[PDB]
């Protein structure tokens, strides 16, 4: 057993090894690609209304294993159990939502060509290779798999190596739903196996949810293979609070946005940018509220935070904290690794964070808030856009006109005005800059992996 | 002067050197990137109706230099002068079309979120680097530049090195129209210069129209730099004729589709796939019609074909003809380089072309038709899909239902039934497989380089 030969699951609350799974071999890869190719060949011929009904079947099979799934999520990566349950319910509802609204988004599109000669058809592309992360082991898979399969594609999952118990359980749910094994499939492939599949003609495109470094490594290969990719990568979302904000609501949303899933959220509020007049009141309220978050065993529902998922990533997070403190930030809360067998890092708040500091320029993928003072709203917008990332953003202010104007100038894919940032089937998700490109959910996730095909009759 | 240090224009009809231009230097690249960034910063703030009026100004300035532009196209790459005039007219009309229909396509999109709390906004992305080919030196630039700039982006053109006279004239047209500095720009960059620009933060995304080899080279770099790209690459379009086809119309469309622009068309009919019962009658009519095409001085309007654009590519095309004849195909017309100072290659027809031959597997980017016999309609579909390419396709048959079913199974981005394949502002354009990914024209070309942004108010 070694990370060079096996995927390994470890409980981050206890440090105990849970399972191992060897990398797929040459024959496993070939068999997966044959099954995927055969599955897509038949699935692409099915009726759209039949596929919608199969989505409802997926939702039912998932709910039927909802607690088994939630406990597996919590066990493998440390998520508080009620958050894992909420992840299951949101994933199941996504099946029903696309079942109801998806088919109409795939209807032929008329054009302005005379005599109704030309229409746009949304054709399936093929089998989509999907590379997914551990922070939402179910939702991240379902977010793409549901629309991708509804559009008549196949989906081939390469999951993160620390949640292969989750991966096998998801496959069992799709099996329970009667989804053919070619249509939803999966492989415990190492990175070289991923490389081989991208080069294989039976993979039509790639979708990646992960870090910036993974997106660049995989995106380069997809381009070299002339395969389209969607990259949903890291974020360092700004959370702007102006002097006229609803301060109580802003702090509630600020705390929820930073510390949900023990801070391990792509679109988490990570860089708090507070106008000078309200900064002292915001900072004091935010520290007190963050300090009231209980942390411990994620099977105990009194805990708002669990351990972080990966011991090496807690080390990396603490290193970023220490560098930021050494650069001149002030420690207001937390900021030390909990001793013991568990991978615990307490709610942490860093103040006097300047744009030159590590916690302002890197993704802080854990329960570490950075607080930066803005001279005014113009400064707050400049601070917000001064980032390699560009996934999402929040603005708190009672001047809705100003909020709308700032939203137009924020370099990110989502802007929440006076509310709680989240993903939702009804709206687009995805960012700009090093957060990547392409859009998921709504009709965007349905169309990203369609062959958009012009059919033009009698052009004479 | 050597192609190692300079871009060189040579008149293919005469062989005379027209112009030379050294590659852009480090200062030139930096200057262009600075002005692109500043131009985009101000351009993104303008009102959509102002930008629509500026598109009309581009169309006016282009029509004012229409004969000068047409003659420059013909002089640098050999296109018959009336096709160059048509290219200018189509490009000017594209400006007016997007001016009229573009703004509504950029309006905010309602969502299913209750109480109208969330909309989808189509924001500008930044400066788009555009890598373009010589076969339509004006239209390829305008096809993307017009919607890209209408959406509030900037456009930085890296044109093919044999048409830098066209590139400079295009820039003069944008100057005549009053397009602000850095909103439209261009550089005579060598391949390393392109690599540098892709890695530069002031390039937001890349669009490529060119060969499969260029798309793989550039696409890999875009992915590694986390830049979205659109790849519009080569084609080897099938042209299927079944026994019940309107034979006279099929032959007319077959000759027009193969030999327009002296065959140098991405979506040209390149692989003719004819059902056995009608193959002899098709082949004899096609040879006779192809033989009736006049070739010569492209400034003379009686000539349907000019010389090929590049002397090295004629050598390459003839090598493809020789290899295919060596593999067992039959030469029915043409098939030898014309003697003299001009780069002329006659209309050529190769028959008994089987799937294993060079003319069936590679893009024949010149006036060479390949004819393959299909046993039946299912064999024809299989033959059509047995290709690395997948740009467009044509089916001729009076059985509309069968044509619609084949269209759904053709692995390509466009299918023309009983008609002449062409690009048009009102429909999507783009392919699958090694022909690339992404879509141009209609609302697709407008949205490819937008930041699709959710704006959600009061999500509490
Ligand atoms: N934008 C989004 O939608 C979104 C959603 C969730 C998480 N994320 C991001 O995910 C990241 C954390 O999750 P992570 O730790 O699993 O990131 P990660 O990149 O290290 O791992 C992501 C996935 O990519 C695979 N992978 C990584 N490198 C690879 C390579 N060279 N070849 C093939 N496969 C490779 C991993 O095995 C894993 O399955 C954070 O940056 C977070 O912001 C983004
Ligand atoms: N799909 C489409 O919309 C479309 C339209 C027109 C032409 N084409 C294709 O264009 C091709 C012919 O034009 P071409 O001969 O100029 O193709 P080409 O690939 O040789 O050159 C295309 C462009 O890419 C640039 N380029 C090539 N390699 C590069 C590299 N490594 N780095 C940076 N830049 C590079 C060239 O300088 C040129 O500007 C044909 O294959 C044709 O089918 C496609």
Residue numbers in the entry:
A (entry chain B), B (entry chain A): 3 to 462
What's the paper's own text on this?
The NAD(P)+-dependent succinate semialdehyde dehydrogenase (SSADH) Sad is a member of the ALDH superfamily and oxidizes succinate semialdehyde (SSA) to succinate. In microorganisms, SSADHs operate in the degradation of various nitrogen-containing compounds such as putrescine or arginine, where they prevent the accumulation of the toxic SSA intermediate. Our results show that Sad is a surprisingly flexible enzyme that is not only able to detoxify succinate semialdehyde and glutarate semialdehyde but can also functionally substitute erythrose 4-phosphate dehydrogenase in pyridoxal 5′-phosphate (PLP) biosynthesis and glyceraldehyde 3-phosphate dehydrogenase (as well as phosphoglycerate kinase) in glycolysis under physiological conditions. We show that Sad, which primarily functions in the detoxification of succinate semialdehyde in various degradation pathways, does not only accept closely related substrates, but also converts phosphorylated sugars as a side reactivity.
EG2.2s had acquired a non-synonymous substitution in sad, resulting in an amino acid change of Q262R; while EG2.3a, EG2.4a, and EG2.5a were predicted by the breseq pipeline28 to carry amplified genomic regions that encoded sad (~80×). To understand the molecular basis of the improved enzyme activity in the Q262R variant, we solved the crystal structures of both Sad WT and Q262R variants with bound NAD+, as well as in complex with both NAD+ and SSA. The Q262R mutation significantly increased activities on E4P and GAP. Further kinetic investigations revealed that the Q262R substitution had significantly improved the Km of Sad for sugar phosphates. While we were not able to obtain structures with sufficient electron densities for the alternative sugar-phosphate substrates, we manually fitted E4P and GAP based on the NAD+/SSA-bound structures. These analyses showed that the Q262R substitution likely altered the electrostatic charge in the active site to better accommodate the carboxyl group of SSA, and/or the phosphate group of E4P and GAP, explaining the dramatically improved kinetic parameters for the E4P dehydrogenase reaction in Sad. R262 is likely responsible for an improved coordination of the phosphate group of E4P and GAP.
